[PDB]
Enzyme design. Structure first.
Site, PDB file in Angstrom:
ATOM      1  CG  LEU B  15     -34.409  -0.555  -1.283  1.00 35.18           C
ATOM      2  CD1 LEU B  15     -35.500   0.364  -1.804  1.00 35.18           C
ATOM      3  CD2 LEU B  15     -34.312  -0.420   0.231  1.00 35.18           C
ATOM      4  N   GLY B  16     -32.944  -3.811   0.378  1.00 34.58           N
ATOM      5  CA  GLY B  16     -32.203  -3.941   1.613  1.00 34.58           C
ATOM      6  C   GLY B  16     -32.400  -5.314   2.216  1.00 34.58           C
ATOM      7  NE  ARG B  17     -28.844  -8.869   0.537  1.00 33.04           N
ATOM      8  CZ  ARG B  17     -28.618  -7.926  -0.368  1.00 33.04           C
ATOM      9  NH1 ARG B  17     -28.482  -6.656  -0.023  1.00 33.04           N
ATOM     10  NH2 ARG B  17     -28.527  -8.266  -1.650  1.00 33.04           N
ATOM     11  N   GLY B  18     -32.251  -7.692   6.203  1.00 32.97           N
ATOM     12  CA  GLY B  18     -32.458  -7.630   7.636  1.00 32.97           C
ATOM     13  C   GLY B  18     -32.171  -8.976   8.263  1.00 32.97           C
ATOM     14  CB  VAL B  19     -32.624 -10.160  11.762  1.00 29.20           C
ATOM     15  CG1 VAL B  19     -32.102 -11.342  12.564  1.00 29.20           C
ATOM     16  CG2 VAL B  19     -32.046  -8.853  12.282  1.00 29.20           C
ATOM     17  CB  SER B  20     -36.101 -12.968   9.741  1.00 24.38           C
ATOM     18  OG  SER B  20     -36.545 -14.192   9.180  1.00 24.38           O
ATOM     19  CB  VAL B  22     -35.650  -9.544   2.218  1.00 23.05           C
ATOM     20  CG1 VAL B  22     -34.509  -9.143   1.321  1.00 23.05           C
ATOM     21  CG2 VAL B  22     -35.317 -10.822   2.974  1.00 23.05           C
ATOM     22  CE  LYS B  38     -40.993  -4.014   6.897  1.00 17.95           C
ATOM     23  NZ  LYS B  38     -41.978  -4.600   7.851  1.00 17.95           N
ATOM     24  CE  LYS B 141     -33.273   1.599  19.078  1.00 16.84           C
ATOM     25  NZ  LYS B 141     -32.426   1.303  20.260  1.00 16.84           N
ATOM     26  CG  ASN B 144     -36.346   1.819  13.583  1.00 20.93           C
ATOM     27  OD1 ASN B 144     -37.428   1.415  14.001  1.00 20.93           O
ATOM     28  ND2 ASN B 144     -35.255   1.065  13.569  1.00 20.93           N
ATOM     29  CB  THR B 176     -30.481  -1.319  19.311  1.00 17.25           C
ATOM     30  OG1 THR B 176     -30.493   0.093  19.076  1.00 17.25           O
ATOM     31  CG2 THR B 176     -31.332  -2.012  18.252  1.00 17.25           C
TER      32      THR B 176
END
Ligand SMILES: C/C=C(\C)CC/C=C(\C)CCC=C(C)C
EC number: 2.7.11.19
Lengths: 986, 371
Positions: B15-20, B22, B38, B141, B144, B176
């Site tokens: 579905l999505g990705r991130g820094v580390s 998924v 996740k 954010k 988020n 951030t």
């Protein structure tokens, strides 16, 4: 005592089949002519036309308790054998073509679509007809497998078993081979252009699955009579079917022949959502009240085409719109789909619809018209009001192809036949969900000293020698082994060609001469290319390759990937495992890696829980090898090694693979790439890599920007020609040649895993991709282009892949938007539907001119808005500006007309210069900043374009944005051309 | 264990990705119900040193805790259960078919007043639950924030959250840069300030208001520290032509969250009490003095007259007003923003160099290049 009523009603069906089909069967050959006018037998039509006989024979065999209904069952069954054998002789008389097509997938070496119904000879020549129809041999191969499974003994000799085995390699490359297809006309244009049709790709997948471990001699057969099918080519056809569907090709939005792929007889689509979506797309765009059109803009027998010309001119395509001939053949497919799916409602709506188009003839028997054509006078009425005018039956009467499925559908709808009897191989269950498989992985150590490094990190592995008697080999060796499957010297068959083996082939356990064989997966092969010399790329390829395995395993047992850890996968120190691989190995022990369930273990433990395929052709070159197997500065050296001359490949000695050896150990990517170019090391999967990008409605252009030197790929090219085109488009520079194909793998890698980065790019221009990748790596670590050119050679494959993903995904490490417009107009990245929005605007205009090159409104009628050929026309006009940043200014300038076009009721009715709108927008951007306090220094002109550099750097929206000034100058130009304007709907 | 993971769920698509981390969709085999998982790589491909490997676990072990402290609440995801391995940490939660608010804010550049009201009505009512349980987020954010098919807000990634001990104020810089409250930076640039409390979330929520209703962060500029001085000093403007078409009830509530001094900030409980989030409950007696009745009838007239007057005022789109000033008037400005984000909507991502304000140029080039 008396015959059952089923037998009595089958007599009426026997009369219907005899009077319509079986009375035309040639006495000598068993073939069926298309009609009295077309006295030849088509391979595809004959197979389809015999289904009614096969279904009737199966229906009669259900009650074979008397002499007579045994005999008519025998007649129908052996009439099917006669035709399928007769069709075998037609193809077996062209074994030279089958052998030639296996290696060179050319149209000139394809099995003929039509044969002499009287002598099983070729009626027409290799170039006098559109012969390459991979869905005609596949319809033969699929039903040959199915009819043998039903008990019909067609194949009679082991030589024919070899021929059918060699026919598998003939239809294996259907995913990467363009063909004329089911309608023998190639693309929609009907100009002799072969295209990748989903019907051919789908049909081969079903035929390959049907023939997979199938005994051609029936139950009374042996391993010599078994056809062996490799799931690599089977699931490669899936990757194309999923990408193509609901489209039939890049040129056809839909074809009603996809009903022959989604439901019957192929069942080649595994996602039920795709089946329903494609079937409904056929419903909306093709079905009317006289059948279904074959494909949009068909014009096969439309009264607006001259029956003398074999080809169609480009302008004639728009003449066929909405008046296309409608074929009730496809309504028999919907009836057949309903019987298989189990939708009694579906078998009713298409049965009454078909019964009202069936033309009665002879003694009241129903005849299926080939097509229903618009009367010449009534063509204009259907132009305006679609699918309502009365059509007249034309073409073949009966359509022996369509008539058979009508009887077959009638037989299975009135309880004379079951879906399983017509589909003994259970293809109808292809849509049922398949759970993901657990991928077994046995990490191995090349040497004992590597086993200790893994042990020091807590990794339980066996050495390469400890696995003996199980012996591991490179993936290439497996490819060489299958080159002996189907070999028949007298028939001049050389077996399977050398094709790259994926995990689905190399994850099986192979039983060659009673010795269990496991083959290392191909992505770790280091001699072929440099993608195996980057350990960060091994994990990335392994991550996707497990993901490919778990979701696409269709064999008994669990897949077994034997992963040997090599010295290259260690650290530069040589005493520690590389962290990327180190993380990868522990990842597998915990049971999850790359979305796949990994049960790590030893290769001995997985002997009983793996696909143990017995390679019986090895049972008494590669056999001889297997017989013994069973029993100063480096950079300077290239300047030396390239000034030996052009690579002589002989012994002018006083073997760069040895020099390629150290650079693999030191992992200097600039040098190792140069050796690959000067040794011409080439990847083995670029032809699936190009095809995967091609199958997603994209055109691949490799080569530097100028058109004569940049060649476009729009049709699936075979391995040799595609590589030759890249090498010739390499204009001699060997570094670009590898980078061209290296990026091609990464483009296909991201396309398969993240399709969303190419939604804004309809043409994949690899050649400028190196250029656009050069600029960002030039601006980062600011240096010259030549240093960046040397820099681009130097990054690791993973870094190169990341940097390309850095390019494509839109992530940012002159000016900000100047770097976001030189990266947006150099890749020709355009918003979704922009090519579908130019069509709307051009209908309100006379054309769109860029640098005085017009794109007229005549194109709007010529191609559809969704036609990719139209996308080329808009694209071709947009590259008439050399500078990339100005092109994007033109791109959003086009859209500010689109958004102003909706507001404006009236039409401009003249030419619009998209370039100029930027220019006064540059001029009007000039005035406002002068008034607000801009100096002449900040507003500096771009030397070539004529746009201010600040305008390039300006943000899109805002009070002073680029598209506020271009929404400003897209009105003063309409002032002069349109003296009076009315703007409504705000 | 991983066996416990696959005994209950089966991951289908990414579905999505991130820094580390998924995010992966799964099917719950016992229930056949859609759920999101996740998948955090603890080892992170080997880049994570043993400290970060340990720290990510402790951050993840903490992360289960807050998501275990808040449950059953309509507008935060429910961590259905959590599985930890030596190399991964799987967390299964609700499936949100639509993506983050950032993705939505990319599709619709300016988010309408009615839509944002229920969006944040949930978010403020989310904020009340966190503050009543005394848990601050520090990370509010729009990426988020997750939205479902009914547009309902599902606040996600309490990865930076930490429970304040009663009357304790943090010092670590977590978040951030754009969405950081003024005293976040001030505590980063000084030791005297003894920390920030639960009032941090109020500023971050008020930032979403300027982003959602205008398509840009309240304070944004391309260099890092320059944004910070706009934050601590607190120089924000409802600039023209953009911010003049919205009703005045919007502006005041924006300033309330955006006050630089924390104690004067507009806490969540009274935040929902501002006139914007007032709802029309049909069954109210609403007794009034005779002056109160006279206002209502006068105001009822004053309203009808008003609506006719406001409408009469709207200027139809003509050729000239397009030539003079497109952005000035609403229908063409929202359009320019809309086709701004269709061409370069891929150029907006998470971080500082990819914010939405990069797609807006609201100031002359000279003033931009003044320093
Ligand atoms: C309401 C628009 C006002 C100024 C702009 C002028 C519009 C046009 C000049 C013609 C461009 C497109 C046409 C599609 C049909």
């Amino acid at each position: 005592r008396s015959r059952s009523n089923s037998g009595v009603r089958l007599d009426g069906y026997a009369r219907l089949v005899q009077q319509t089909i079986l009375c035309h069967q040639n006495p000598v050959t068993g073939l069926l002519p298309a009609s009295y006018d077309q006295k030849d037998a088509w391979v595809r039509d004959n197979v389809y036309s015999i289904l009614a006989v096969w279904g009737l024979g199966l229906a009669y065999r259900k009650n074979a308790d008397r002499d007579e209904d045994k005999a008519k069952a025998y007649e129908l069954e052996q009439s099917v054998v006669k035709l399928m054998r007769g069709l075998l002789h037609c193809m077996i008389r062209q074994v030279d073509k089958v052998e030639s097509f296996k290696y060179s997938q050319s149209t000139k070496d394809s099995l003929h679509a039509k044969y002499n119904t009287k002598t099983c000879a070729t009626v027409v020549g290799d170039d006098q007809w559109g012969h390459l129809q991979l869905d005609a041999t596949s319809v033969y191969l699929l039903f040959l497998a199915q009819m043998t499974a039903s008990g019909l003994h067609i194949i009679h000799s082991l030589d024919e078993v070899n021929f059918i085995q060699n026919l598998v390699f003939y239809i294996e490359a259907a995913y990467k081979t363009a063909d004329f297809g089911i309608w023998e006309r190639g693309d929609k244009t009907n100009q002799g252009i072969s295209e990748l049709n989903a019907s051919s790709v789908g049909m081969a997948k079903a035929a390959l699955e049907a023939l997979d471990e199938l005994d051609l001699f029936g139950v009374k057969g042996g391993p010599q009579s078994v056809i062996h099918v490799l799931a690599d080519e089977v699931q490669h056809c899936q990757s194309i079917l999923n990408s193509l569907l609901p489209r039939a090709s890049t040129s056809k939005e839909v074809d009603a022949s996809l009903l022959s792929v989604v439901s019957f007889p192929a069942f080649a689509v595994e996602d039920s959502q795709l089946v329903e979506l494609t079937k409904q797309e056929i419903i909306t765009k093709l079905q009317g009240r006289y059948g279904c059109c074959r494909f949009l803009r068909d014009g096969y027998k439309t009264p607006k085409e001259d029956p003398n010309r074999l080809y169609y001119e480009p302008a004639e395509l728009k003449l066929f719109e909405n008046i296309e001939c409608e074929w009730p053949l496809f309504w028999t497919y919907f009836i057949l789909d309903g019987v298989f799916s189990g939708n009694a409602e579906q078998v009713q709506e298409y049965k009454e619809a078909l019964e009202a188009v069936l033309i009665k003839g002879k003694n009241g028997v129903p005849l299926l018209p080939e097509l229903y054509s618009v009367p010449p006078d009534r063509v204009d009425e259907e132009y305006q009001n679609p699918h309502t005018v009365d059509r007249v039956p034309m073409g073949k009467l009966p359509h022996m192809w369509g008539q058979s499925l009508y009887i077959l559908g009638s037989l299975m709808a009135e309880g004379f036949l079951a879906p399983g009897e017509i589909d003994p191989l259970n293809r109808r269950f292809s849509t049922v969900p398949k759970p993901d498989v657990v991928v077994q992985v046995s990490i191995l150590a090349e040497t004992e000293e590597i086993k200790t490094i893994l042990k020091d990190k807590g990794i339980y592995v066996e050495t390469i020698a400890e696995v003996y008697p199980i012996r591991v080999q490179p993936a290439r060796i497996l490819s060489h082994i299958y080159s002996s499957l189907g070999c028949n010297n007298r028939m001049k068959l050389s077996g399977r060609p050398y094709r790259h083996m994926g995990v689905l082939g190399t994850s099986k356990l192979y039983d060659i001469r009673k010795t269990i064989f496991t083959f290392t997966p191909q992505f770790i092969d280091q001699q072929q290319f440099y993608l195996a010399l980057d350990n960060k790329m091994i994990v990335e390829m392994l991550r996707t390759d497990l993901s490919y395995l778990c979701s696409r395993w269709r064999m008994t047992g669990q897949p077994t990937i034997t992963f040997p850890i090599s010295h290259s996968m260690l650290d530069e120190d040589g005493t520690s495992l590389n962290s990327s691989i180190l993380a990868a190995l522990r990842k597998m022990q915990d049971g999850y890696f790359g979305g796949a369930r990994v049960q790590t273990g030893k290769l001995s433990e997985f002997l009983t829980t793996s696909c143990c395929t017995h390679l019986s052709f090895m049972d008494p070159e590669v056999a001889r090898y297997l017989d013994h197997l069973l029993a100063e500065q480096a950079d300077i050296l290239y300047m030396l090694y390239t000034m030996k001359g052009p690579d002589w490949n002989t012994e002018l000695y006083n073997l760069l693979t040895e020099l390629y050896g150290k650079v693999g150990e030191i992992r200097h990517w600039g040098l190792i790439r140069y050796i690959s170019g000067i040794l011409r090391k080439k990847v083995e999967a670029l032809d699936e890599a190009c095809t995967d990008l091609l199958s997603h409605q994209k055109h691949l252009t490799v080569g530097l920007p100028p058109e004569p030197r940049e060649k476009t790929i729009s049709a699936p090219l075979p391995y040799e020609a595609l590589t030759q085109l890249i090498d010739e488009a390499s204009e001699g520079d060997m570094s670009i040649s590898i980078l061209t194909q290296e990026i091609m793998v990464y483009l296909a890698m991201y396309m398969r895993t993240q399709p969303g980065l190419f939604a804004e790019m309809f043409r994949l221009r690899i050649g400028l991709i190196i250029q656009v990748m050069a600029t960002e790596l030039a601006h980062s670590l600011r240096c010259s282009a030549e240093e960046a050119t040397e820099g681009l050679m130097n990054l690791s494959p993973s870094a190169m892949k990341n940097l390309l993903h850095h390019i494509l995904s839109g992530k940012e490490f002159q000016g900000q938007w100047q770097r976001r417009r030189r990266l947006d107009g150099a890749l020709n990245r355009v918003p979704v539907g922009f090519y579908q929005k130019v069509w709307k605007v051009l209908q309100k205009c006379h054309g769109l001119s860029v640098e005085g090159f017009v794109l007229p409104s005549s194109t709007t009628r010529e191609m559809t808005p969704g036609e990719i050929k139209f996308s080329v026309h808009v694209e071709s006009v947009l590259n008439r500006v050399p500078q990339p940043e100005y092109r994007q200014l033109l791109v959003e300038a086009i859209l500010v007309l689109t958004m102003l076009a909706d507001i404006e009721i009236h039409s401009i009715g003249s030419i619009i210069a998209v370039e100029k709108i930027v220019h006064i927008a540059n001029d009007l951007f000039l005035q406002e900043q002068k008034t607000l306090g801009a100096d002449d220094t900040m507003l500096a002109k771009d030397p070539a374009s004529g746009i201010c550099t600040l305008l390039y750097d300006s943000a899109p929206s805002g009070r002073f944005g680029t598209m506020t000034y271009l929404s400003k100058a897209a009105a003063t130009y309409v002032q002069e051309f349109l003296p009076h304007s009315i703007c409504a709907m705000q | 264990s991983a066996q416990d993971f696959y005994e209950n769920y089966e991951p289908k698509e990414i579905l999505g990705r991130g820094v580390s981390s998924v995010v992966r969709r799964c099917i719950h085999k016992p229930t056949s119900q859609e759920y999101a998982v996740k998948v955090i790589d603890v080892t992170g491909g080997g880049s994570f040193s043993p400290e970060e490997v340990r720290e990510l676990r402790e951050a993840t072990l903490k992360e289960v805790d807050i998501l275990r402290k808040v449950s059953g609440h309509p507008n935060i995801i429910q961590l259905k259960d959590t599985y930890e391995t030596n190399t991964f940490f799987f967390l299964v939660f609700d499936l949100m078919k639509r993506g983050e608010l950032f993705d939505y804010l990319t599709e619709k550049v300016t988010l309408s007043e009615k839509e944002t009201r229920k969006i944040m009505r949930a978010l403020l009512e989310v904020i009340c639950t966190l503050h009543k349980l005394n848990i601050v987020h520090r990370d509010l954010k729009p990426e988020n924030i997750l939205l479902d098919d009914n547009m309902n807000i599902k606040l996600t990634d309490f990865g930076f959250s930490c429970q304040l001990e009663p009357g304790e104020r943090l010092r670590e810089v977590c978040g951030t840069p754009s969405y950081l409250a003024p005293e976040i930076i001030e505590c980063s640039m000084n030791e005297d300030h003894p920390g920030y409390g639960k009032e941090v979330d109020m500023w971050s929520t008020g930032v979403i208001m300027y982003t959602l209703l205008a398509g840009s962060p309240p304070f944004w500029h391309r260099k890092q520290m320059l944004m910070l001085r706009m934050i601590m000093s607190g120089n924000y403007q409802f600039g023209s032509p953009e911010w003049d078409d919205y009703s005045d009830t919007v502006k005041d509530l924006v300033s309330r969250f955006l006050v630089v001094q924390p104690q004067n900030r507009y806490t969540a409980e009274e935040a929902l009490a501002h006139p914007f989030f007032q709802q029309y409950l049909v069954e109210e007696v609403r007794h009034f003095s005779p002056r109160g009745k006279f206002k209502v009838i006068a105001l009822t007239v004053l309203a009808s007259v008003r609506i006719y007057y406001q409408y009469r005022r709207v200027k139809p789109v003509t050729r000239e007003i397009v030539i003079r000033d497109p952005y000035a008037l609403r229908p063409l400005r929202r359009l320019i923003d809309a086709y701004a984000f269709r061409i370069y909507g891929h150029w907006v991502k998470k971080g500082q160099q990819q914010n939405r304000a990069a797609l807006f140029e609201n100031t002359p080039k000279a003033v931009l290049l003044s320093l």
